[PDB]
């Protein structure tokens, strides 16, 4: 939050609602697998990279 205030002129910020998070994760969400932008179209890709963290599915 101290770093964000230095860059305030360049950015806009706010607390996101769960529906806003869902729409970003579903409609615009793309993974970073092997430094590639891989579209998140299934719960399998999330399981593959985040099963260690217990983030098996999109929910």
């Amino acid at each position: 939050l101290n770093a964000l205030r230095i860059v305030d002129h360049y950015v806009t910020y706010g607390e996101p609602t769960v529906e806003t998070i869902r729409n970003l994760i579903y409609k615009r969400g793309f993974a970073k697998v092997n430094g590639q932008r891989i579209p998140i179209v299934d719960n399998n890709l999330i399981d593959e990279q985040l099963s260690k963290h217990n983030i098996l599915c999109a929910e």
């Binding site: 579903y26 409609k27 793309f30 891989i38 579209p39 998140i40 179209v41």
Partner: protein, 309 residues
């Protein structure tokens, strides 16, 4: 160890000779092309322009105030003594002090002629070089040709060992070349045909006027003859004496050991299919599925993959 066949003038197998070690030498196109390029430059004749060319006339700059360019001008006012001036010296005149000849180490020159000889014994390289060898019965071709002094005798021997189509490819190929080469005493171009190598036999008179046929002695095998155009693969008609003495010429190099044979692409492929490498090979993890993005909310089937419920 393989033994090559020796054919008679009639074209029938007469006797067998063991294969010389030179043919086993690794085929190095890169070395044969490097040695070919430097040796052909050595044969070059020096050219240059005259030192006095374009500096014989008397020209000094007119200078400023005359409304003319400052280049040196003759008494008439005609531009002179400049690259851009008609009747003027070259900016950098061609000079005879150029190093026309390049240098090759004896080992590298010997390596190139050994590799060119090995390419001659490879049937594929000879056909690829454009020689017609389908009729020829064995590569390398060794013939017990006695002293042939008549072209007609030589033609008969070459018809009976299958080299006739190559001799006719070169006879029917004689044409006036293109360019100013004609005016420069290089008017006609013919194809290159078989190379006769001979030892202790007078075969030169018989094959000398045959078209495209070139002759060489076993003591002085020439690379430019062995690899025409830097391309190795010469159809070589060896006499029985010449082939027999090839292993004696290689001994005559006081301290030269023929390069040691190496694997081929086919050998590398066979090893890559051998059981030992296959046993070492481990199967890879299955790849990732990229799948182009679709709106999840667009259809219930799309939504189900991200949200099953």
């Amino acid at each position: 160890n393989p033994t090559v066949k020796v054919f008679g003038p009639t074209g029938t197998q007469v006797a067998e000779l063991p294969r010389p070690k030179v043919f086993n030498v690794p085929l190095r196109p890169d070395i044969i092309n490097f040695v070919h390029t430097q040796l052909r430059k050595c044969l070059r004749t020096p050219y240059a322009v005259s030192r006095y060319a374009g500096v014989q006339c008397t020209a000094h700059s007119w200078g400023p105030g005359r409304a003319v360019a400052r280049l040196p001008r003759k008494h008439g006012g005609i531009g002179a003594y400049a690259n851009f001036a008609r009747g003027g010296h070259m900016a950098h005149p061609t000079t005879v002090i150029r190093r026309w000849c390049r240098k090759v180490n004896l080992n590298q020159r010997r390596y190139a002629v050994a590799s060119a000889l090995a390419a001659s014994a490879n049937a594929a390289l000879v056909e690829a070089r454009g020689h017609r060898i389908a009729d020829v019965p064995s590569i390398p071709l060794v013939v017990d040709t006695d002293n042939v002094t008549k072209t007609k005798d030589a033609l008969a021997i070459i018809k009976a060992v299958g080299v006739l189509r190559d001799v006719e490819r070169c006879k029917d190929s004689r044409h006036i070349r293109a360019g100013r080469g004609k005016m420069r005493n290089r008017r006609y171009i013919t194809r290159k045909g078989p190379l006769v190598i001979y030892n202790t036999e007078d075969v030169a008179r018989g094959f000398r006027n045959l078209p495209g046929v070139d002759l060489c002695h076993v003591s002085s095998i020439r690379l430019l003859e062995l690899a025409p155009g830097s391309h190795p693969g010469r159809l070589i008609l060896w006499t029985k004496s010449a082939f027999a003495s090839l292993d004696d010429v290689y001994a005559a190099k006081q301290n030269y050991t023929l390069p040691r044979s190496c694997i081929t692409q086919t050998d590398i492929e066979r090893i890559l299919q051998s059981d030992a490498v296959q046993k070492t090979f481990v199967p890879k993890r299955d790849p990732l599925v990229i799948e182009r993005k679709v709106d999840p909310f667009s259809s219930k089937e799309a939504l189900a993959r991200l949200d099953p419920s």
